Design a protein around this nucleic acid. Structure first.
Ligand code: JHN
Lengths: 511, 381, 511, 381
DNA sequence: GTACCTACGGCTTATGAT
DNA sequence: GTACCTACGGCTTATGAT
DNA sequence: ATCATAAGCCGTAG
DNA sequence: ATCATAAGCCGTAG
């Protein structure tokens, strides 16, 4: 059986591959700025129960679990992704606090996956806060046996804080990091005014930030990038001349190198350039870097101003490198070039939706709790007839049915809001003193203990009931009024800022 | 090249032997252990292969084992293995490496493609086992039809319509048309909300002639908004709007919905009314309202339950069908048993191969790699 | 600070390495015949909860868990050990039922650890039966944070069933497999008579067994091995001549090869020997092996009897290979050459000890259960005064103290063995009708529910009490009488035999 | 050889630089990232190394980087790196590779060993952190003494003996002697059961002169068996036996114990009575009976509890001490931070190296590999 | 995605020496 | 115990051609 | 003197 | 013609 097939089959397969990759592998999302791999790793670490205030764990457990349940694509990629997050010099705010040889700027790779130890950091629990309260949707795994959160209910706009860099079949993205307090201030400003201009936002956010400080020259590049979505920016290292108070000679000190530069490759290339005589005025080369800060010393050839040498280096050496800012991410499962205002608006909308859903969930939970507690109190009111009715009833099911069948007296000491103290699916034929029960209520009553018969539990139940009434009233009010929701979001953002603020590292000297 | 990986067969005469190409270590072991030892051959591979166009150098060569083993690379002289087959995984990387191999063959040896020697295999995709009942399923639509047939195992509905016991091929076709319409609605959902699209199932009909009376439009939109606010169990509301954009009337309804923090309107125009999608929706709505499916009784097969929603009854039937079934999905050739691999892929009586043609001389392989065709071709919108 | 050290330091370090290896890595134990790696793997699989009647699981989970918690020695060794157990042609009774490419006799290695699926087999749960009832001791892990069983409470003498082969620093061991029913029959015979001779045991156990059948020639070797501990044995493949009814020609068929022989290497070596003309009368070589049994066909050169060729092959070809039987294992943490009778005696002693400890544990558990149930019944007897005493008592602790303080009436309907219905640590001042309580009993009474007040729970409690009395009486009797213990062991062994018997594979033709 | 792995220092003059040897990929990264860049050097290694004696061939060479980098292999001419150090893990494989390297050096270049250039490092073994209190512990006996000191943080016992408040160095020495005796008993346990060895702590004394009266021996063994049957909480019993193996008396007690299924006797002889182990046991028993430690009161430091057993009080004190401590054990050099590695191993002020000597010319390296010395030397019994 | 080095004993098989 | 090949886009840097 | 062509690296994957 | 010497492979480890 060999049915003839046209050659056009090539187009259908390749298009499928491209459409799968672009959606599922490289490009991050605007709502949280997380690739699916990072998502699944964080979810696995949370499900396993590895918080920050606990003992460390071996990498093998986490890697094996991730390969087993959620991400069936080998091990090397997953382990490299984990090692990447732990390095301080590669992320402005690390997520996976580790312990062991994680490599360094010298280009040395990390140790094997059977030596290191990892656990979450304090900032990590802020990403996955309120996960169990039904705030997002769940998606099936590869075989349809588990559930995976679609988007994390975040509290921090990670996309602008860290950014990422991926290369798809047709598109490619690149985003610089930023500072946290400035992003929070910009979000506050946009919450105050919906129609803020790009100039206003640029006033609150001067420019990017890097894990290692540097110097930035051009203002046109970052402005064009924030306004349109494309632009270029230059990065310049920090150095200066030195002359001893006495005869001595002139010497250059380098304190910090640009972003993502191998130091050993740099030293070797400089040695090669000096050997090739392409550069002038360099005699030797040494190193003094230690555990107190990086320090490179270059000895200037005698009778040379050295500043022309420094300019020639800046022209030819890796000490000055460009950077291809290009903002591309997914908005509804489709790549779209998006500027700053769009990102901020998306973040705000996501936060609103999460807050609303969490509020609804907590309201329903408190409603059901109060509904059970009411019947429990009513049962506690009349005890002796229920005692006799149970003692006479041969069958527990028959006792439940008898409890359901008869009304109840509702003593005076037993006896809130006009409504909203009862669930939605409850029918108006219950709770019309006069009072009736339900099968669920009767089972709850039968599931009592004897410790509930002292002069403490009565007051405890009354207090719990009053507290639940107050809470459900507050929740109904916060659902009703949108200004209250805005105030809540503002307070949460201010708290996050006060908790996790810090100072600037880089510096922007305009031309 | 010839030793190391290639494992030929006993026969040496070409035009009778078969050759295969797979991922090396994982799949080749099972392939060798399950193949035949008479007229079968296997050539494993390593990872991926460089493009012919993106990097073209007659000196650029790393493996070359394919050419070395197939011919001398020119081709009319030596013609060993007149039949070649490409087995590849069912993931996306499988299709990727498939496309790479196909463009390699096309841009290297056009004659071997013209003379019909390349073949494509079709590995199964799903293994369904319901106790004794086993099943090999290879395609998504096949799996869908199988699930539909299992859910529709001779059920019999009892409404109060003209049919005392509605059942059979009529019900099957009705469920199929409903599923097609639901898929179409889910596809168009990207444009408009879902509440209105789902409620127009039960809402009455509509016609361009209704733009005369304002009261007809008002009653229609009021019923719609009232039923929407009734069915709204989440945190949202619904409001109506009547607008006149014409010289005299051209009455056009407008719906005002209030989600979390921002309202959004959705006007109705002549183009929306005339759209074939809305026409199909109205046809299905009329067909479903002509049913009187309120008091219903369908059994499959030892239990029946009356509900008030056709889709809820369908969901209950699907749940009853999917209670106790088992499904295994093979996500790699190096995962199944050798005898299963034999019986499902390389049995000269049970396999289902696929042949390639040379239809035209086109520039698809040219738009392949210039980055401009790459930027423009994804117009799947 | 550099203190002078003698050169003798070499002896102390090497001796430590040897003493560690010999005890912990290679040599198995006489009590279960299991290397520590197999032990830890089985224990991890049991703790994870992967039984035989459940769905499969990926190898990555198990491997990562074993590396993480119990066996910190990399991954390749562990995965190879797991793959070794799954192969049918390498163990007489496999333990790890798997699914995927596990290699074959052709020398092809198994697939990567990200494709296969594994789970325990039905015979595996017989190795680890009664593990939680405190039958063996627990040893700390490498960091002292977990517990590991020392020896498995087995029901099968695995050492004689499968055997092993390891190479230590000074010693080396090797043991052939055997058949199960014969070992069980020998154990029964030794249970009947303590002073059986070696000839008697050799009567019940003819000889070894192999996963693939073969032919054995020498009886002297196995006899000397069983009697002393060392010996040699020959293995001969099965083949025969074939002549067609008509003219045709003579042809050789091979059905099965000896133990642990690569088929591809064999075919290549035979082709080489034919090419070198060292052997005569061989024309060509073919293969017909399929999924119905291995089949190798050799075409005899015309005008050759071929039997001389067959004898020359048997002399030179791998078709006849020797085997170095050498029985060495650990008896109390020290290597000792041990014969058959010693192994059987050790097995019997281990089984006796396990049974006794399990019986003691179950006795104590039933004792405590009955002790609680007695007080619960006594409380159920008098209900109304306890109701009033709880209703008046403000504090639950005060209510407990009041319940402890006063005696109780012990109504007539409320009222076994002369003794043994009360725990050991219980003092004679309780239960002297007259009756007193305990704090534990009072807490149990306070932890009652209302469902215990129907005309069903009374009879259920009375039935449970009678059953517990019968059970504790039976346990005391089985602890008292050793003949009962022997009968129990005999019955268990007979049941195991009837469950897991099978037929012989190999065959022994004496010279 | 010279490139690839070796990372020398700035100084080129020998007799001032340091060289190290470790396992390559895991440890070398941390070593490089934590070392000094003035007079330090690192040479990673791969796996294990072949023996010099078991396989001797001047042509047999695989790595040779050690020789190529150290000298020209002859040695008086080039003498670079006058100081070499061997860092190695604390496991058993560490000691194994250490022995291999040492025998290599010895059988290749005797002069470099004679002139005192080889050194051995001593990495720490335990990291104990009690809140603020940190501690680096390198040895098992050091860890034991540390645990003892933590458990004995100035406690004060109150018995009814001659000392109103027994405490201090006397109690420390008593606990130390008790621990030594318990270790000796655990070592000798391989011979005799443990119940009798533990009960002779509190049982009265004994003397060879007691073989005169049969009643003295009878009373002694009766008290012993009665206390054993009292303390027996497991499934066992105890029975006595009186035997006369002499011309007239030479009375010798015999104990009959009944375990699970078989009884076992344990006679008492003149050699057992005179044994120094039994003598130490009797001395300790007399010292402990001269205490009257029944009504005791020891506090450490905010709680005290009277018990009836000195060992039970000691166990309670150990438990109170070990309630809330933290211990990290480094089972590999590629596990700690680079700064910690620096401070604990390669600080010219804090490190604790070790020097090797050339004492005699012996055949230890000959008995190394002949399989006969290998079979005979493990006489650790 | 994939190949090639070492230890440890006891068995053999191949090969050149006396 | 450990090293070296491939895809995918966008940036650069080096190098020889016109 | 000015332009076309060949490389290397960044992160998930094989 | 008969004896001493050098190899290869089996399974947990590096
Ligand atoms: O394929 C090759 C070919 C040659 C080669 N040379 C050196 C080398 O180091 N390697 C070479 N290779 C490859 C690599 C060895 N490779 C084997 C697989 C291993 N897998 C690591 C692992 C996987 C898992 C673990 C732990 N570790 O636990 C969880 C479950 C999965 C990593 C090292």
């Amino acid at each position: 059986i060999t049915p003839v097939n046209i050659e056009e089959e090539l187009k259908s397969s390749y298009l499928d591959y491209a459409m799968s990759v672009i959606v599922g592998r490289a490009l991050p999302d605007v709502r949280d700025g997380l690739k699916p791999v990072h998502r699944r790793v964080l979810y696995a670490m949370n499900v396993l129960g590895n918080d920050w205030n606990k003992a460390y764990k071996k990498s093998a457990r986490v890697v094996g679990d991730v390969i087993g349940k959620y991400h069936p694509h080998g091990d090397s990629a997953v382990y490299d992704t984990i090692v990447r997050m732990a390095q301080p010099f590669s992320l402005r705010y690390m997520l996976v606090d580790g312990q062991g040889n994680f490599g360094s700027i010298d280009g040395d790779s990390a140790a094997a996956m059977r030596y290191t130890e990892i656990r979450l950091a304090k900032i990590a629990h802020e990403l996955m806060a309120d996960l169990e309260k039904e705030t997002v949707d769940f998606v099936d795994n590869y075989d349809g046996t588990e559930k995976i959160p679609d988007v994390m209910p975040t509290k921090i706009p990670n996309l602008l804080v860290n950014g990422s860099s991926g290369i798809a079949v047709g598109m490619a993205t690149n985003i610089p990091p930023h500072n946290l307090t400035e992003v929070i201030n910009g979000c506050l400003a946009y919450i105050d005014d919906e129609d803020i201009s790009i100039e206003g936002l640029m006033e609150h956010i001067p420019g990017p930030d890097f894990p290692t400080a540097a110097i930035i020259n051009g203002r046109r590049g970052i402005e064009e990038a924030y306004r349109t979505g494309r632009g270029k920016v230059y990065i310049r290292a920090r150095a200066e001349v030195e002359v001893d108070a006495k005869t001595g000679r002139e010497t250059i000190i380098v304190h910090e190198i640009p972003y993502q530069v191998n130091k050993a490759r740099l030293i070797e290339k400089i040695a090669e350039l000096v050997k090739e005589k392409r550069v002038e005025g360099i005699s030797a080369l040494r190193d003094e870097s230690d555990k107190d800060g990086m320090r490179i010393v270059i000895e200037v050839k005698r009778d040379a101003v050295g500043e022309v040498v420094l300019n020639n280096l800046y022209s030819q050496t890796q000490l000055q490198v460009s950077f291809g800012i290009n903002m591309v991410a997914l908005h509804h499962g489709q790549p779209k070039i998006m500027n700053l205002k769009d990102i901020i608006a998306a973040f705000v909308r996501h936060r609103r939706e999460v807050v609303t859903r969490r509020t609804i969930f907590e309201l329903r939970k408190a409603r059901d709790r109060a509904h059970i507690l009411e019947a429990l109190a009513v049962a506690l009111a009349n005890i002796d007839p229920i005692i006799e009715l149970i003692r006479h009833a041969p069958t527990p099911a028959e006792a439940k049915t008898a409890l359901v069948a008869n009304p109840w007296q509702l003593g005076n000491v037993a006896a809130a809001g006009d409504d909203a103290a009862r669930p939605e699916w409850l029918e108006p034929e219950f709770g019309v003193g006069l009072y009736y029960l339900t099968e669920q209520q009767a089972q709850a009553i039968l599931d009592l203990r004897l410790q509930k018969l002292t002069g403490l539990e009565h007051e405890k139940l009354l207090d719990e009931y009053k507290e639940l009434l107050d809470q459900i009233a507050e929740l109904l009010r916060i659902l009703g009024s949108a200004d209250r929701l805005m105030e809540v979001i503002r307070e949460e953002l201010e708290l996050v800022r006060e908790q996790f603020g810090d100072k600037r590292r880089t510096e922007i000297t305009a031309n | 090249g010839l030793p190391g990986k290639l494992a030929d067969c006993q026969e040496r005469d070409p035009a009778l032997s078969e050759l295969y190409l797979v991922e090396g270590d994982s799949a080749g072991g099972s392939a060798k252990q399950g193949r035949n030892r008479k007229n079968q051959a296997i050539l494993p591979l390593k990872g991926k292969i460089l493009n012919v166009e993106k990097a073209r150098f007659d000196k650029m060569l790393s493996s070359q084992e394919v050419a070395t083993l197939i011919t001398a690379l020119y081709n009319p002289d030596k013609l060993r293995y007149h039949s070649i087959i490409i087995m590849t995984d069912a993931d996306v990387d499988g299709s990727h490496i498939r496309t790479l191999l196909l463009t390699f063959f096309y841009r290297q040896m056009p004659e071997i493609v013209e003379r019909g020697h390349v073949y494509i295999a079709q590995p199964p995709l799903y293994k369904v086992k319901k106790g004794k009942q086993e099943q090999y399923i290879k395609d998504d639509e096949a799996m869908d039809q199988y699930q539909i047939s299992i859910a529709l195992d001779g059920a019999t509905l009892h409404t109060n319509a003209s049919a005392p016991a509605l059942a059979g091929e009529a019900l099957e076709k009705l469920v199929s048309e409903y599923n097609a319409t639901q898929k179409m609605i889910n596809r168009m959902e990207r444009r408009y909300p879902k509440a209105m699209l789902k409620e127009l199932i039960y809402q009455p009909t509509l016609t361009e002639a209704d733009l005369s009376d304002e009261q007809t439009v008002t009653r229609w939109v009021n019923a719609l908004v009232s039923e929407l606010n009734d069915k709204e169990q989440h945190g949202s509301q619904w409001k109506f709007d009547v607008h006149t954009n014409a010289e005299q009337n051209l009455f056009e309804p407008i719906v005002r919905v209030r989600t979390h923090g921002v309202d959004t309107d959705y006007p109705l125009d002549h183009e929306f009314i005339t759209g074939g999608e809305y026409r199909r929706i109205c046809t299905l709505g009329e067909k479903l309202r002509g049913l009187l499916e309120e008091d219903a009784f369908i059994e499959r097969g030892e239990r029946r339950q009356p509900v008030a929603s056709f889709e809820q009854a369908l969901d209950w039937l699907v749940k009853e069908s999917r209670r106790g079934l088992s499904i295994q999905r093979y996500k790699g050739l190096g995962e199944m048993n050798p005898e299963q691999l034999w019986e499902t892929t390389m049995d000269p009586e049970s396999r289902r191969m696929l042949r390639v043609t040379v239809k035209d001389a086109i520039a698809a392989d040219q738009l392949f790699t210039t980055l401009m065709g790459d930027a423009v071709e994804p117009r799947r919108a």
